[PDB]
Design a protein around this ligand. Structure first.
Ligand code: CL
Ligand code: MG
Length: 210
């Protein structure tokens, strides 16, 4: 079963704004997705202080950045708390209706697209660079799921029975044809050093075969 859902009007609005607005500083998508991974890793860290068994699905708390030039994908993987099916359907755990409203109001009062993360909807900045985003997630409380959307108003959710992840979330960006600089090692290193240099978990940038 693949289930197909409509984005709530606010999110469809937000996604169309991200896709259509001329805005050159697209590189902030990676800061926003690393930020979301850090917040998910903080959540499982906190739960484990009182219940160490929550780490039976993997003790290591880390983020991996995986470029793949053959597939035109950049994947951000973390071993944070992951999301349940209900969280995926509910705007990937975000308060995206109210966040979208506050972000629009801020843009009127002089903010710019790079401030999106302040409003709790930074995930959607993926659409600055990707034509399609796939999110694979596993929470201790639930099965592994894949969410997917190429925007256009709808997203799908389906049980994933690809390679099991112990716990956490993988964001797979299928990059736009003109945004392949974000698969280049030196470009990813530069962005991590510029915007994510104090994140409190290891960030490993994977190498590709020649
Ligand atoms: Cl909300
Ligand atoms: Mg925060």
């Amino acid at each position: 079963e693949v289930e197909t859902f409509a984005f709530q009007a606010e999110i469809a609005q937000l996604m169309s704004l991200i896709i259509n607005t001329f805005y050159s500083n697209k590189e902030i998508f990676l800061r926003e997705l690393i930020s979301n991974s850090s917040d998910a890793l903080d959540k499982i860290r906190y739960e484990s202080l009182t219940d160490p068994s929550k780490l039976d699905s993997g003790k290591e708390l880390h983020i991996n950045l995986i470029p793949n030039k053959q597939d035109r994908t950049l994947t951000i993987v973390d071993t944070g708390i992951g999301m349940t099916k209900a969280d995926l359907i509910n705007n990937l755990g975000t308060i995206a209706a109210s966040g979208t409203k506050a972000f629009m109001e801020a843009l009127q009062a002089g903010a710019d697209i790079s401030m999106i993360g302040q409003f709790g909807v930074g995930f959607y900045s993926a659409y600055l660079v990707a034509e399609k985003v796939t999110v694979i997630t596993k929470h201790n409380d639930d099965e592994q799921y894949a969410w997917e959307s190429s925007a256009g108003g709808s997203f799908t959710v389906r049980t994933d029975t690809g390679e099991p992840m112990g716990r956490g979330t993988k964001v797979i960006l299928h990059l736009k044809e003109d945004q392949t600089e974000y698969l280049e090692e030196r470009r990813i290193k530069e962005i991590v050093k510029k915007h994510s240099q104090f994140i409190g978990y290891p960030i490993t940038l994977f190498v590709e075969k020649e």
